[PDB]
Design an enzyme around this catalytic site. Sequence first.
Site, PDB file in Angstrom:
ATOM      1  N   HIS A  14       0.869  -1.205   0.000  1.00  0.00           N
ATOM      2  CA  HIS A  14       0.000   0.000   0.000  1.00  0.00           C
ATOM      3  C   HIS A  14       0.895   1.241   0.000  1.00  0.00           C
ATOM      4  CE1 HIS A  14      -3.611  -2.487   1.048  1.00  0.00           C
ATOM      5  NE2 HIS A  14      -2.636  -3.278   1.499  1.00  0.00           N
ATOM      6  N   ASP A 113      -6.670   5.209   2.317  1.00  0.00           N
ATOM      7  CA  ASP A 113      -6.775   3.809   1.930  1.00  0.00           C
ATOM      8  C   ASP A 113      -8.043   3.188   2.522  1.00  0.00           C
ATOM      9  OD1 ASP A 113      -5.970   1.320   0.770  1.00  0.00           O
ATOM     10  OD2 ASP A 113      -3.907   1.469   1.501  1.00  0.00           O
ATOM     11  N   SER A 252       5.245  -9.152   0.753  1.00  0.00           N
ATOM     12  CA  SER A 252       5.772  -8.562   1.976  1.00  0.00           C
ATOM     13  C   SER A 252       5.036  -9.015   3.227  1.00  0.00           C
ATOM     14  CB  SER A 252       5.710  -7.028   1.915  1.00  0.00           C
ATOM     15  OG  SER A 252       4.348  -6.577   1.875  1.00  0.00           O
ATOM     16  N   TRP A 325      -1.019  -7.337  -6.048  1.00  0.00           N
ATOM     17  CA  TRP A 325      -1.363  -6.481  -7.186  1.00  0.00           C
ATOM     18  C   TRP A 325      -0.164  -5.686  -7.689  1.00  0.00           C
ATOM     19  CZ3 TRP A 325      -4.636  -6.977 -10.767  1.00  0.00           C
ATOM     20  CH2 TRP A 325      -4.977  -5.917 -11.620  1.00  0.00           C
ATOM     21  N   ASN A 326       0.690  -5.192  -6.789  1.00  0.00           N
ATOM     22  CA  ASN A 326       1.875  -4.488  -7.282  1.00  0.00           C
ATOM     23  C   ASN A 326       2.782  -5.426  -8.062  1.00  0.00           C
ATOM     24  OD1 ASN A 326       1.607  -1.687  -6.070  1.00  0.00           O
ATOM     25  ND2 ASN A 326       1.459  -2.974  -4.233  1.00  0.00           N
ATOM     26  N   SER A 327       2.913  -6.680  -7.602  1.00  0.00           N
ATOM     27  CA  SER A 327       3.741  -7.645  -8.328  1.00  0.00           C
ATOM     28  C   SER A 327       3.139  -7.973  -9.677  1.00  0.00           C
ATOM     29  CB  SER A 327       3.932  -8.927  -7.502  1.00  0.00           C
ATOM     30  OG  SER A 327       4.650  -8.661  -6.312  1.00  0.00           O
ATOM     31  N   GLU A 330       3.766  -4.795 -11.910  1.00  0.00           N
ATOM     32  CA  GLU A 330       5.181  -4.788 -12.276  1.00  0.00           C
ATOM     33  C   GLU A 330       5.466  -5.827 -13.345  1.00  0.00           C
ATOM     34  OE1 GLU A 330       6.813  -5.343  -8.379  1.00  0.00           O
ATOM     35  OE2 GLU A 330       6.272  -3.286  -7.810  1.00  0.00           O
ATOM     36  N   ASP A 346      -6.911 -10.643  -2.022  1.00  0.00           N
ATOM     37  CA  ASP A 346      -7.264 -10.411  -3.420  1.00  0.00           C
ATOM     38  C   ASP A 346      -6.479 -11.290  -4.390  1.00  0.00           C
ATOM     39  OD1 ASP A 346      -5.151  -8.734  -2.418  1.00  0.00           O
ATOM     40  OD2 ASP A 346      -5.110  -7.651  -4.330  1.00  0.00           O
ATOM     41  N   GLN A 347      -5.480 -12.045  -3.918  1.00  0.00           N
ATOM     42  CA  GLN A 347      -4.586 -12.759  -4.831  1.00  0.00           C
ATOM     43  C   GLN A 347      -5.280 -13.768  -5.738  1.00  0.00           C
ATOM     44  OE1 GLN A 347      -1.815 -14.042  -1.770  1.00  0.00           O
ATOM     45  NE2 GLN A 347      -1.662 -11.886  -1.127  1.00  0.00           N
TER      46      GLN A 347
HETATM   47  O1  LIG Z   1      11.592  -9.276  -2.039  1.00  0.00           O
HETATM   48  C1  LIG Z   1      10.782  -8.404  -2.403  1.00  0.00           C
HETATM   49  C2  LIG Z   1       9.421  -8.629  -2.267  1.00  0.00           C
HETATM   50  C3  LIG Z   1       8.532  -7.651  -2.671  1.00  0.00           C
HETATM   51  N1  LIG Z   1       8.993  -6.516  -3.188  1.00  0.00           N
HETATM   52  C4  LIG Z   1       8.075  -5.462  -3.604  1.00  0.00           C
HETATM   53  O2  LIG Z   1       7.055  -5.321  -2.627  1.00  0.00           O
HETATM   54  C5  LIG Z   1       5.806  -5.041  -3.250  1.00  0.00           C
HETATM   55  C6  LIG Z   1       4.841  -6.158  -2.920  1.00  0.00           C
HETATM   56  O3  LIG Z   1       3.512  -5.728  -3.122  1.00  0.00           O
HETATM   57  P1  LIG Z   1       2.400  -6.738  -3.652  1.00  0.00           P
HETATM   58  O4  LIG Z   1       1.196  -5.934  -3.958  1.00  0.00           O
HETATM   59  O5  LIG Z   1       2.963  -7.517  -4.783  1.00  0.00           O
HETATM   60  O6  LIG Z   1       2.084  -7.781  -2.466  1.00  0.00           O
HETATM   61  P2  LIG Z   1       2.235  -7.682  -0.861  1.00  0.00           P
HETATM   62  O7  LIG Z   1       3.674  -7.796  -0.579  1.00  0.00           O
HETATM   63  O8  LIG Z   1       1.967  -6.366  -0.288  1.00  0.00           O
HETATM   64  O9  LIG Z   1       1.369  -8.808  -0.422  1.00  0.00           O
HETATM   65  C7  LIG Z   1       6.059  -5.017  -4.740  1.00  0.00           C
HETATM   66  O10 LIG Z   1       6.258  -3.665  -5.136  1.00  0.00           O
HETATM   67  C8  LIG Z   1       7.352  -5.779  -4.889  1.00  0.00           C
HETATM   68  O11 LIG Z   1       8.102  -5.312  -6.002  1.00  0.00           O
HETATM   69  C9  LIG Z   1      10.371  -6.309  -3.316  1.00  0.00           C
HETATM   70  O12 LIG Z   1      10.788  -5.239  -3.786  1.00  0.00           O
HETATM   71  N2  LIG Z   1      11.222  -7.254  -2.922  1.00  0.00           N
END
Ligand SMILES: O=c1ccn([C@@H]2O[C@H](COP(=O)(O)OP(=O)(O)O)[C@@H](O)[C@H]2O)c(=O)[nH]1
EC number: 2.4.1.-
Length: 428
Positions: A14, A113, A252, A325-327, A330, A346-347
């Site tokens: 987030h 948020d 994360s 969602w960020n992954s 990306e 949400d995955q």
């Molecule tokens: O070893 C890692 C793991 C995750 N990320 C970054 O952490 C964010 C993870 O967000 P995501 O929405 O994918 O899932 P969440 O971690 O929050 O469940 C993304 O930007 C990843 O690029 C990273 O930089 N290195």
Amino acid sequence: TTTILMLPWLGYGHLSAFLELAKSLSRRNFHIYFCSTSVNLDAIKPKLPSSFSDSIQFVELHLPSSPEFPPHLHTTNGLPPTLMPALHQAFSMAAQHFESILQTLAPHLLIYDSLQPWAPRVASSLKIPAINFNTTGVFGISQGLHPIHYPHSKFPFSEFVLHNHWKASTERTRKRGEAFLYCLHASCSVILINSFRELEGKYMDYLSVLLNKKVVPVGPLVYEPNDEGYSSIKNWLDKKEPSSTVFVSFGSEYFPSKEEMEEIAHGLEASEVNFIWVVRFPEDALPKGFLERAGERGMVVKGWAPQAKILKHWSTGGFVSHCGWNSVMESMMFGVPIIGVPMHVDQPFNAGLVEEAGVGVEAKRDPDGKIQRDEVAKLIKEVVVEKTREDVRKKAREMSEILRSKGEEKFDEMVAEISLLLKIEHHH
Ligand SMILES: O=c1ccn([C@@H]2O[C@H](COP(=O)(O)OP(=O)(O)O)[C@@H](O)[C@H]2O)c(=O)[nH]1
Ligand SMILES: C[C@H](CO)OC[C@@H](C)OC[C@@H](C)OC[C@@H](C)OC[C@@H](C)OC[C@H](C)OC[C@@H](C)O
């Protein structure tokens, strides 16, 4: 100068999406107060180029602290899941400090948020307009709202079926859903969402009708850097063949069980792919001898990896992802096909959207919800090692081309709605 205070939920993903939106607003000459707990501000600061610091200022929010729940735990990042109730409770108790911050800084706008119904209430009490920003996509939200209105009709714009693993207190669940929907419903005039119409346009329109509120996309929001262990990793990747390696990460805020790690590891081994796998601890949960047998094909990175730099490397051919969602965004921006191993929240919806976009595949769970090593191996084999899924690689390239052609104009709609909302509320 028009000022915006931004309040992400306390999750690294987030924080990440909110920081990319803050950069977009700084480029339109807004001044941003970026508000979170110190442990989250420390984690995200490396992603802010120094050129932004004049216009994007960090503001520490304080949660109640105790020796059993100190400030370093005031984040979901690497948090024991049994502390998640305490984190939500402590965040709600920050509303008084949040009110003091808003009184002192008097921003013209709050962007908040979806895990903090108290935030729009505090803003309203101070006559500060407040807009909700969702860092997820639309698909899963609309899938959650649809059965509220149509409990006996299938979701209309997809063939996706949620696996029983995820479908399985009811009152506690209703109240969590009500709090989440309140954050969207309470938003002034529009809801901002980290998505784009080529992927989710028809789900945006559906969500907008269900909520009777305008949904404004502001995505793709994808961080791109320019040595947190990268030099060693780069040298290792540089010695692989093109598109031969999978990055493996579950985000994360999730720790896969030993049983899940067993199936992923054996799937990676049978596939004979090169892999970089981020393993995190809140002990060794890898099968005995797995790394030794993998030899130079395999690399385990403890704790944290430079995910964006790895995904952009020419040697990277696939992404075994929990489909956060960020992954997902990306991987689409960078053209890397996803092998989806969703875990929760949400995955599973993100994975089904990926599969239905054709830009990746989903490893299916067994009837009792277990991950299947054979499915992981098969999909890495088809998508990466043998590349017999040319259609997926082509679709992933085409999506990357679409996403790379987007520019500043993706924020035009948000900026116009902010301008209108502030001109109306200044009158009121
Ligand atoms: O070893 C890692 C793991 C995750 N990320 C970054 O952490 C964010 C993870 O967000 P995501 O929405 O994918 O899932 P969440 O971690 O929050 O469940 C993304 O930007 C990843 O690029 C990273 O930089 N290195
Ligand atoms: C997270 C996901 C959502 O994205 O799951 C959320 C879910 C768990 O929340 C369930 C909760 C929102 O139930 C709402 C229900 C009361 O609304 C019924 C509707 C048909 O209107 C009834 C009637 C006219 O209106 C009554 C209402 C207006 O007070």
